[PDB]
């Protein structure tokens, strides 16, 4: 080719959107932004297929143009704006502040929070760039460059930033004994404690994650997102809290579900 | 012995011209647990492609082989072996792949048929894309 691509085919779209086959040919291109392509979720789906607040593509255009949605502190009007991991979608007209957390299966489900809680978010740091004639910066995983960080906070740590000032409050150093959120691979949406890390110079390191139910699996470190110290997490969680029931246990939760309700 | 060339050979990083009352020698490590040889620091050889005293890093893969030809200058030829596997017939077959490897002069006791361990780097020439990290001896025969 000669320039960059712009369109997107329905089949080549990522799996965790759960788009059907018939309705069309193209899938909406995620705009250039902070998050990766295969790691985000557009507002036009979140407001047309997941929440179903509107049906047609022009009426999505007739929503965010009325200065309603204030993402993490500042209103964007791009109807296909890429919103990814750790974003506080805030609707002013009904107040239903949303947080986008991974389900127990490999997808993004709708998780509501309270407006009291919609004040901060937890960000994973990526690097420390020392700006000479001066001070070090930071680069988190959503590309939030910050000045004057700390002489303590290091490469793979997590911090608790604020919305309207873009400033830190607290932080957690990565030690074996914190929580863990597996962001990517065959364990996309699991939570457990950390028990071991292995060094592979030149190569990439790996980390064993123990589920609360004994199930000890493994995961390379670039999918790790520490959220809490000890056993205690710091935010609310979706329902399940990272069960990952077996495939035959879904028989039980699907059978005695109705039978225990009606 | 040294400087048989039309230009002047030197390491570029050091200033050798202050009020002189031997020059300090440049050398670095490599990582991955490889010791520098004794002959490098003490040695007066100079090169811009040696992985100890030049502007080249060491990255990627690490291989092995065996030395078989030394007629060229500052490069030697090794011979890798492996075994392909047909699954139709439940057997193997032999192959051999060869390559041209840049040789630092810090290694001296290298005869023919010596097990070597190479390392990937930036492309140095048309076909040399590897450096020699260590050279062993074959099955005895010291005499």
């Amino acid at each position: 080719a000669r320039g960059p691509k712009k369109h997107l085919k329905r089949v080549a779209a990522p799996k965790h959107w759960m788009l059907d086959k018939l309705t069309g040919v193209f899938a909406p291109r995620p705009s250039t932004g902070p998050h990766k392509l295969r790691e985000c979720l557009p507002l036009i789906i979140f407001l047309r297929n997941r929440l179903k607040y509107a049906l047609t593509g022009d009426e999505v255009k007739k929503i965010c143009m009325q200065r309603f949605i204030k993402i993490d502190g500042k209103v964007r009007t791009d109807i296909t704006y890429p919103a990814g991991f750790m974003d506080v979608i805030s609707i002013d007209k009904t107040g239903e502040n949303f947080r986008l957390i991974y389900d127990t299966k490999g997808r993004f489900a709708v998780h509501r929070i309270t407006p009291e809680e919609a004040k901060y978010k937890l960000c994973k740091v990526r690097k420390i760039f020392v700006g000479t004639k001066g001070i070090p910066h930071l680069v988190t995983h959503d590309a939030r460059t910050i000045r004057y960080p700390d002489p303590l906070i290091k490469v793979n740590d997590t911090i608790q930033i604020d919305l309207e000032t873009g400033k830190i409050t607290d932080f957690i150093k990565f030690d074996t004994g914190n929580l863990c959120m597996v962001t990517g691979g065959a364990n996309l949406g699991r939570i457990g404690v950390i028990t071991n890390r292995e060094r592979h110079p030149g190569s990439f390191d790996v980390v064993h994650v123990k589920d609360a139910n004994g199930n000890s699996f493994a995961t390379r470190l670039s999918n790790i997102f520490v959220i809490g110290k000890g056993n205690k997490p710091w935010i609310s969680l979706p329902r399940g809290k990272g069960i990952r029931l077996t495939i035959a246990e879904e028989r039980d939760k699907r059978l005695a579900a109705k039978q225990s309700s009606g | 012995d040294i400087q048989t060339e039309r230009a002047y050979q030197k390491q570029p990083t050091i200033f050798q011209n202050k009020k002189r009352v031997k020059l300090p020698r440049y050398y670095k490590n490599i990582g991955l647990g490889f010791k520098t040889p004794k002959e490098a620091i003490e040695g007066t050889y100079i090169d811009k492609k040696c992985p100890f005293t030049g502007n080249v890093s060491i990255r990627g893969r690490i291989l092995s082989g065996v030395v078989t030809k030394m007629k060229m200058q500052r490069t030697i030829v090794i011979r890798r072996d492996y075994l392909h596997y047909i699954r139709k017939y439940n057997r193997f077959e032999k192959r051999h792949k060869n390559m041209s490897v840049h040789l630092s002069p810090c290694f001296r006791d290298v005869q023919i048929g010596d097990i070597v361990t190479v390392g990937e780097c930036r492309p140095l020439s048309k076909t040399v894309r590897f450096n020699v990290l260590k050279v062993t001896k074959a099955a005895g025969t010291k005499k």
Binding site: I135, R147, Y148, P151 | -
Partner: protein, 145 residues
């Protein structure tokens, strides 16, 4: 693009050749010089009209401009008039008044945070000298082993 042109020397140049007059005419020829056709419009620009119509630094251009009475078919003619080119400063003050105060704000933001980082190291320096004077004071106790 390639085109086809003609030379710059008039040899056989039939087809009209446009005859401009850049010299004074002294006598009366009928078709040309009967009526001084005026300019279709006049100026706009502001230093060009300030200085052009008999005016100094400290006077006012809000009236010295071409009015152009029209003929409509059911109304009175109206003075169509322009407003361009850096009129002196009615409220363009207001944007410079803000531009020179955000420079006071970004300087305030780089003045509040420098000394604050100086205090945050000011805290961790009592420890930066404490840890050397505590651990090496215990290390001589370990060496006396």
């Amino acid at each position: 693009k390639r085109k086809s042109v003609r030379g710059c020397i008039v040899d056989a140049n039939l087809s009209v050749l446009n005859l401009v007059i850049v010299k004074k005419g002294e006598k009366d020829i009928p078709g040309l010089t009967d009526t001084t056709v005026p300019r279709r419009l006049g100026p706009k620009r502001a230093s060009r009209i300030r200085k052009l119509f008999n005016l100094s630094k400290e006077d006012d251009v809000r009236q010295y401009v071409v009015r152009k009475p029209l003929n409509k078919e059911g109304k009175k003619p109206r003075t169509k008039a322009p407003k361009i080119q850096r009129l002196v400063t009615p409220r363009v003050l207001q944007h410079k008044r803000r531009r020179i105060a955000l420079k006071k704000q970004r300087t305030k933001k780089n003045k509040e945070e420098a000394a604050e980082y100086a205090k945050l190291l000011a805290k961790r320096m009592k420890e930066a000298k404490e840890k050397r004077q505590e651990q090496i004071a215990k290390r001589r106790r370990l060496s006396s082993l």
